[PDB]
Amino acid sequence: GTILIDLSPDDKEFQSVEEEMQSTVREHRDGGHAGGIFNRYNILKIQKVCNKKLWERYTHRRKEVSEENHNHANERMLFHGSPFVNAIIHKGFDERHAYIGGMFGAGIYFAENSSKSNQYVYGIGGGTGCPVHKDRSCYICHRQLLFCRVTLGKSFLQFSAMAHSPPGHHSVTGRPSVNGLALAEYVIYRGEQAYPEYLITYQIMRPE
Numbered sequence: 001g002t003i004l005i006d007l008s009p010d011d012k013e014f015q016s017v018e019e020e021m022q023s024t025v026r027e028h029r030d031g032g033h034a035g036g037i038f039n040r041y042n043i044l045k046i047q048k049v050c051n052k053k054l055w056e057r058y059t060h061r062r063k064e065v066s067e068e069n070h071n072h073a074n075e076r077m078l079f080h081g082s083p084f085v086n087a088i089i090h091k092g093f094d095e096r097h098a099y100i101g102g103m104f105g106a107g108i109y110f111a112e113n114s115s116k117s118n119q120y121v122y123g124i125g126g127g128t129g130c131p132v133h134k135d136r137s138c139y140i141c142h143r144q145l146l147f148c149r150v151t152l153g154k155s156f157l158q159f160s161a162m163a164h165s166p167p168g169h170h171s172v173t174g175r176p177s178v179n180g181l182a183l184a185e186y187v188i189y190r191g192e193q194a195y196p197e198y199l200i201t202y203q204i205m206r207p208e
């Protein structure tokens with residue numbers, strides 16, 4: 001049921017998505033080991049992901065959460081990087097897309113920093129890099145990230161350097177508490193709480 005609709009680079013939607021992608025790159029504590037060395041991306045394509053069934057599944061759950069949280073879904077737009085991006089856009093999020101060894105337990109992880117999600121495009125820790133060159137800092141191969149609509153509801157705040165949500169909460173927020181520049185990360189425990197709205201195709205760019 002999924003179709004992908006290409007956005008024109010002249011479209012304001014393309015432009016606002018590209019800006020969120022570019023402006024949320026930061027330095028990482030691994031010095032680029034997992035995701036590569038770059039300060040910016042070359043955006044090749046942005047597509048809108050359209051699937052009526054998956055959208056209805058998302059809004060149904062969003063309404064349940066909202067009604068449990070004084071009519072506030074606490075919806076964010078967040079990045080997700082995964083080797084399973086092709087399954088996600090066709091079948092939605094589910095337990096198979098969880099990060100089992102994540103620091104907030106087995107759930108589905110999202111980032112405010114696009115460069116954090118970039119670390120997972122080729123697997124946990126960048127795996128072995130691109131399939132063609134075996135290079136985690138490959139500047140040639142095309143990568144994909146999802147920019148997703150995520151319902152957090154009442155989020156459990158974890159201050160910090162598929163399982164269940166902590167009782168009485170709909171998500172967990174990983175607040176950065178050592179790296180002063182890092183943005184937050186978030187975890188949901190039900191795949192119906194995210195919709196994969198934009199597929200972004202890009203390369204990381206070698207600093208000049």
Ligand SMILES: O=c1[nH]c(-c2ccc(Cl)cc2)cc2c(F)cccc12
Pocket residue numbers: 079080081082083097098099100102109110111116117118120123124185186
């Ligand atoms: O985008 C993310 N993806 C993942 C991740 C996705 C799939 C697998 Cl198989 C493992 C980790 C993990 C992750 C994280 F731990 C923090 C912030 C963002 C992300």
Ligand SMILES: [Zn+2]
Pocket residue numbers: 130131132133134135138139140141
């Ligand atoms: Zn490559």
